[PDB]
């Protein structure tokens, strides 16, 4: 999944 800070 996407990183904590990805949009």
């Amino acid at each position: 999944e996407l990183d904590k800070w990805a949009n």
Epitope: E1, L2, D3, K4, W5, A6
Partner: antibody, heavy 132, light 108 residues
């Protein structure tokens, strides 16, 4: 100045449980968006990402090791603990914990996320050997 | 998962050379990429964060560029302390992958 240091047993036997502690100073795991992660390096091999935990307590793990890892924090002691169960010889490696910055804030308003894209300060690393 | 391939895996050079190491991702990672230098017996040290920002206290001969799937680290004037292994790390997708590393050694 941020510094981190790993501690735990240098030797562990197969099937046993390995508990590693990262004690740090210079930041608090209650600071906004901060993270502390764990990375390992078997001798002569590449770095391998293991897990990370943030101050709001979100946790993420390597999918390949998910079932054997638990990461937790103790904010008041400035420590992050990583517990790996059922170790085997391939788990022998140098284990590092590292700091991850949270977004820059201006008057407590997040304005820059570029600083979160790196693990900026690392501990010296602790060598762990798994053998019976 | 996401793959990060470094090139070349090994590279020979001499003090004063300009070298460039590249890292390619299997899917786009935007600008969430970091470069590190690791000397034997020591932990990796952050050189460049967010694909191109120079980390504080890191010498200016180090430079990083690129975004998406292709990134490059260039050291403009190699110094003796640069004979080491370099790694790139992606932080856009979990798990936060590392490349295989590129060893930079004394050419002869």
């Amino acid at each position: 100045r941020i510094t981190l240091k790993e501690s735990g047993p240098p030797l562990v036997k197969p099937t046993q449980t390995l508990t590693l502690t990262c004690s740090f100073s210079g930041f608090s795991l209650s600071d906004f968006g901060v993270g502390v992660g764990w990375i390992r390096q078997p001798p002569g091999k590449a770095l391998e990402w293991l897990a990370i935990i943030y101050s709001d307590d979100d946790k993420r793990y390597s999918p390949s090791l998910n079932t054997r890892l638990t990461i937790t924090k103790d904010t008041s002691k400035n420590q992050v603990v990583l517990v790996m169960t059922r170790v085997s010889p391939v788990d022998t490696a140098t284990y590092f914990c590292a700091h991850r910055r949270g977004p820059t804030t201006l008057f407590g308003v997040p304005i820059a996320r570029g600083p979160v894209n790196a693990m900026d300060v690392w501990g010296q690393g602790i060598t762990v050997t798994i053998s019976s | 998962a996401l793959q990060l391939t470094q090139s070349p895996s090994s590279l020979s050079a001499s003090v004063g050379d300009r070298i460039t190491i590249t890292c390619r991702a299997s899917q786009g990672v935007t600008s969430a990429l970091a470069w590190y230098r690791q000397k034997p017996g020591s932990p990796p040290q952050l050189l460049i964060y967010d694909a191109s920002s120079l980390e504080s206290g890191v010498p200016s001969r180090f430079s990083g560029s690129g975004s998406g799937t292709e990134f490059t680290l260039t050291i403009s004037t190699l110094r003796p302390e640069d004979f080491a292994t370099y790694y790139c790390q992606q932080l856009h997708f979990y798990p936060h992958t590392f490349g295989g590393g590129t060893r930079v050694d004394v050419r002869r």
